[PDB]
Amino acid sequence: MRVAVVGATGAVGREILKVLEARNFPLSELRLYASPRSAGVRLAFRGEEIPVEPLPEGPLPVDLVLASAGGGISRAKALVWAEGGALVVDNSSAWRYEPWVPLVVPEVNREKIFQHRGIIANPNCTTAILAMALWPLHRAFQAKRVIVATYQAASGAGAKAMEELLTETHRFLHGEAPKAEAFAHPLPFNVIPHIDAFQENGYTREEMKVVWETHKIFGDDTIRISATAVRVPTLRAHAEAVSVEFARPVTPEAAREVLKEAPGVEVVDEPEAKRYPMPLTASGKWDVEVGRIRKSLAFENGLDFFVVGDQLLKGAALNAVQIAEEWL
Amino acid sequence: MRVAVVGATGAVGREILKVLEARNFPLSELRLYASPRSAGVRLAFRGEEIPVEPLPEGPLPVDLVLASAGGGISRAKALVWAEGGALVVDNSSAWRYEPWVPLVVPEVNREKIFQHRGIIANPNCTTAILAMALWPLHRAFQAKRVIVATYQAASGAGAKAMEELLTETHRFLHGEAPKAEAFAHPLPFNVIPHIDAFQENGYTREEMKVVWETHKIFGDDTIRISATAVRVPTLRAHAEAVSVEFARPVTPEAAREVLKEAPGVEVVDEPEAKRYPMPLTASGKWDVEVGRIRKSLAFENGLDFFVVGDQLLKGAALNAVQIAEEWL
């Protein structure tokens, strides 16, 4: 199974090698691709060093293409590739909101993988994990209203921004005013209620995704979803205080056992033992932790939970994993 | 006109006297008090230093008393310092919920002042700054359902909890494991979905205050409230993302015009300009920043916004402002 990795040198692309390694993904070939910028650099796989070819304006030669190199190139290459007979999984937002491409999270609509006709859209970060937990609640209790507050990380802004936070928080401690460059403002010791592009209704493209992606990933345009994407001083883990109004009578004790069964969703819920989800323990694991399950006081039949999932893994883990299923 | 500070050395005692010294307070006596732990220290004030006294088991001698030395101590002397003839204004969770005690935020229930019997409670920092936004919106459209995902800083944990945050990040930035002592878990580069202590309902003592406290200051027992409280790696500014369902058709623009006219509350809401509240650009002001005001997609007639206010000031400031009115 010849596989290409368009985007290699990026945060996702780089994690894409290790999970791809860690799941013992059975390749045959090994192809890393980047735009000219990284035309001559080397990464590492199975301890063995592998080159990074710049992308050639001309489709060849692979079975599977795992794209994590912006929408510029993806919007531009998707078709060209799947035509060469390569299965295309893109982590960018170029084909997501398109009627012919399935937007999949293996815990939910794996069924859609085989409804593809050349490409498959990898979901947003904030959406993937939130689904990993919100998938089973929906199926069991039918939601109708979600209100999330995001505690997003630096990795979401790429690797250069993950680094910025290190160096910046560093100069901060030493007196010198943070040199904001990778974010809209200086992020050390602060929060930016601004993740993406502001639309006409007030929300940002990021916020708006929590909805359009859900409405499709679940195939239910009927769920009322509100969300505030906020950037915070954290390396690679996304946090999101969630709330929901249900059809069926919830029970923090019924959502628990149920949650206690869902795949890839470590339940982490113990107040007495100061035991709840945290980027402290979420970052690194393939799972998403979920805690603070409590009978919501806001809604007449609601729940307030907290969720954490590694942000670079809910890019790459669900990627290299959609393929593992393609196999199925 | 004599005043005393009980907890004259704590982070809050120190903002008190500086907004005392800054709002040119009509005092006439400068008695600073603190527990024996600190029975030998001197603070600043109008140029001269003042010695700090250990809390006397002999309540007296003053007219006004800005207490800020904990809960066990205010519970045991509020009544006494009171019988002496002093007016006790306490910034702690100890009297706030007693029937005969007025919980006051000048801008909302000033009149409640003149209906007290010795003690006037000073609400929860995550309520005061939150009340400055929700009040006008509430007495103009009428709240029915509030949901707030707090982003509280280490300032509210304390002085030793701010100082700790700095050295631990620094330590962390240097490749060594944070050694928490001031927080539940290591705070550097992380979020902690737990603030005070857990109640049986599944909610922490923190959240519930943001409710109970709101009911009493507002005079509306009926208002399905719901809080979520998380400590973020920030110095002394508190952020919250809100979503209040309102009865009267509300307007993002109509509500926005209310606020620019609401006291002690500055509006900051220009998306095209990357203009919204930020701990950074709000820590040290007497106004609370509101912005990101938008028509919420969660409910039919609702509003979502971002709120940022300085914790330590909405400790000291709301306290020496209650007294200013104890004069008027």
Q: By the 8 A CB rule, do A286 and A19 touch?
A: yes
DSSP lists the bridge partners of residue A300 as: none
**How far away is chain B from the Cα of A147, in angstroms, using its nearest Cα?**
7
Question: Which pair of tokens denotes residue B279?
Answer: 């701990």
The total of structural domains in chain A comes to: 2
Phi, psi of A262 (to 5 degrees): -55, 145
Write down the catalytic residue from A116, A125, A170, A185. A125
Q: Which amino acid is at A54?
A: P
Q: By the 8 A CB rule, do A223 and A145 touch?
A: yes
Question: Which pair of tokens denotes residue B71?
Answer: 């809960």
What angle do the packed helices B11-22 and B313-327 form, to 10 degrees? 50
The verdict on whether residue A155 carries a ligand-binding annotation is yes
Q: What is the DSSP string of B260-320?
A: TTSTTEEE--BGGGTB---SGGGTT-SSEEEEEEEE-SSSTTEEEEEEEEETTHHHHHHHH
User: CB A111: neighbour CB atoms within 10 A?
Assistant: 10
**How far away is chain A from the Cα of B324, in angstroms, using its nearest Cα?**
32
**How far away is chain A from the Cα of B175, in angstroms, using its nearest Cα?**
11
User: CB B31: neighbour CB atoms within 10 A?
Assistant: 18
Contacts of A22 (CB under 8 A, 6+ apart): none
Phi, psi of B183 (to 5 degrees): -125, 170
The verdict on whether residue A9 carries a ligand-binding annotation is yes
DSSP lists the bridge partners of residue A246 as: A143
Residues in B closer than 8 angstroms to A278, CB to CB, are 185, 190-193
**Distance separating alpha carbons of residues A167 and A233, to the nearest angstrom:** 12
User: CB B319: neighbour CB atoms within 10 A?
Assistant: 27
Bond from prior residue into B36 cis (ω within 30 degrees of 0): no
A81, A170: one domain: no
Q: Tokens 């069926």 appear where? A: A248
A87, A59, A84, A63: which is closest to A73 by C-alpha?
A59
Size of interface A-B (CB pairs under 8 A): 175
A16, A64: one domain: yes
Q: By the 8 A CB rule, do A118 and A82 touch?
A: yes
B286, B206: one domain: yes
**How far away is chain A from the Cα of B173, in angstroms, using its nearest Cα?**
7
Q: What is the DSSP string of A151-211?
A: EB-GGGG-HHHHHHHHHHHHHHHTSSPP---SSSS--TT--BS--S-B-TTS-BHHHHHHH
Asked if A277 and B193 come within 8 Å (Cβ–Cβ), the reply is yes
**How far away is chain A from the Cα of B28, in angstroms, using its nearest Cα?**
38
Q: Tokens 């560093």 appear where? A: A170
A82, A200: one domain: no
Q: By the 8 A CB rule, do B113 and B120 touch?
A: yes
Q: By the 8 A CB rule, do B322 and B120 touch?
A: yes
The verdict on whether residue A11 carries a ligand-binding annotation is yes
A60, A65, A62, A58: which is closest to A6 by C-alpha?
A65
A261, A316: one domain: no
B150, B287: one domain: yes
Residues in A closer than 8 angstroms to B251, CB to CB, are none
Asked if B224 and A194 come within 8 Å (Cβ–Cβ), the reply is no
Asked if A170 and B173 come within 8 Å (Cβ–Cβ), the reply is yes
B92, B84, B85: which is closest to B6 by C-alpha?
B92
B280, B323: one domain: no
User: CB A293: neighbour CB atoms within 10 A?
Assistant: 25
Question: Which pair of tokens denotes residue A273?
Answer: 């033992």
**Distance separating alpha carbons of residues A118 and A78, to the nearest angstrom:** 8
Q: By the 8 A CB rule, do A178 and A222 touch?
A: no
Q: Tell me the CATH number at A284.
A: 3.30.360.10
**Distance separating alpha carbons of residues A297 and B180, to the nearest angstrom:** 32
Strands A302-310 and A237-246, bridge-based pairing: antiparallel
The verdict on whether residue A205 carries a ligand-binding annotation is no
Closest residue in A to B208 (Cα) is A297
**Distance separating alpha carbons of residues A65 and A93, to the nearest angstrom:** 16
Question: Which pair of tokens denotes residue B119?
Answer: 């003690």
Q: Which amino acid is at B217?
A: I
Q: Tell me the CATH number at B108.
A: 3.40.50.720
B125 in active site: yes
Phi, psi of A52 (to 5 degrees): -125, 100
B228, B235, B177: which is closest to A277 by C-alpha?
B228
Most A CBs within 10 Å, among B174, B189, B205, to test the A interface: B189
B32, B179: one domain: no
Strands B29-34 and B64-67, bridge-based pairing: unpaired
3-state class (DSSP) for residue A110: helix
Q: Which of A169, A230, A280 sits opposite B241 (nearest CB)?
A: A230
B91, B190: one domain: no
Residues in B closer than 8 angstroms to A298, CB to CB, are 145-147, 224-226
**Distance separating alpha carbons of residues B71 and B92, to the nearest angstrom:** 6
**How far away is chain B from the Cα of A229, in angstroms, using its nearest Cα?**
9
For B286, the domain range is 123-311
Asked if B190 and A278 come within 8 Å (Cβ–Cβ), the reply is yes
User: CB A23: neighbour CB atoms within 10 A?
Assistant: 14
**Distance separating alpha carbons of residues A236 and A309, to the nearest angstrom:** 9
3-state class (DSSP) for residue B200: coil
3-state class (DSSP) for residue B152: strand
User: CB A85: neighbour CB atoms within 10 A?
Assistant: 11
Asked if B306 and A193 come within 8 Å (Cβ–Cβ), the reply is yes
**Distance separating alpha carbons of residues B166 and A2, to the nearest angstrom:** 49
Q: What is the DSSP string of A224-285?
A: EEEEE--B-S-SSEEEEEEEEEESS---HHHHHHHHTTSTT--B--BTTTTB---HHHHTT-
In terms of phi and psi (left: phi > 0; alpha: psi -120 to 50; beta: otherwise), the region of A112 is alpha
Asked if A194 and B149 come within 8 Å (Cβ–Cβ), the reply is no
**Distance separating alpha carbons of residues B43 and A10, to the nearest angstrom:** 53
Phi, psi of A42 (to 5 degrees): -125, 140
A192, A66: one domain: no
**Distance separating alpha carbons of residues A55 and A310, to the nearest angstrom:** 29
A14, A92: one domain: yes
A125 in active site: yes
**Distance separating alpha carbons of residues B224 and A20, to the nearest angstrom:** 47
A225, A277: one domain: yes
The annotated binding site of B for substrate is made up of 152, 231
Elucidated via: X-ray
Closest residue in B to A178 (Cα) is B280
**Distance separating alpha carbons of residues B165 and B160, to the nearest angstrom:** 9
Specify the DSSP element, H or E, that contains B79. Answer: helix B72-83
Q: Which of A226, A235, A296 sits opposite B189 (nearest CB)?
A: A235
Asked if B274 and A203 come within 8 Å (Cβ–Cβ), the reply is no
Question: Which pair of tokens denotes residue A253?
Answer: 């004790």
Most B CBs within 10 Å, among A130, A145, A146, A147, to test the B interface: A147
Residues in B closer than 8 angstroms to A148, CB to CB, are 149
User: CB A96: neighbour CB atoms within 10 A?
Assistant: 22
**Distance separating alpha carbons of residues A75 and A327, to the nearest angstrom:** 25
Q: Tokens 């207490």 appear where? A: B67
3-state class (DSSP) for residue A136: helix
**Distance separating alpha carbons of residues B75 and B81, to the nearest angstrom:** 11
Phi, psi of B236 (to 5 degrees): -150, 20
Residues in A closer than 8 angstroms to B211, CB to CB, are 297
Asked if A147 and B147 come within 8 Å (Cβ–Cβ), the reply is yes
Work out the end-to-end distance of chain B between its first and last CA atoms, rounded to an integer number of angstroms.
14
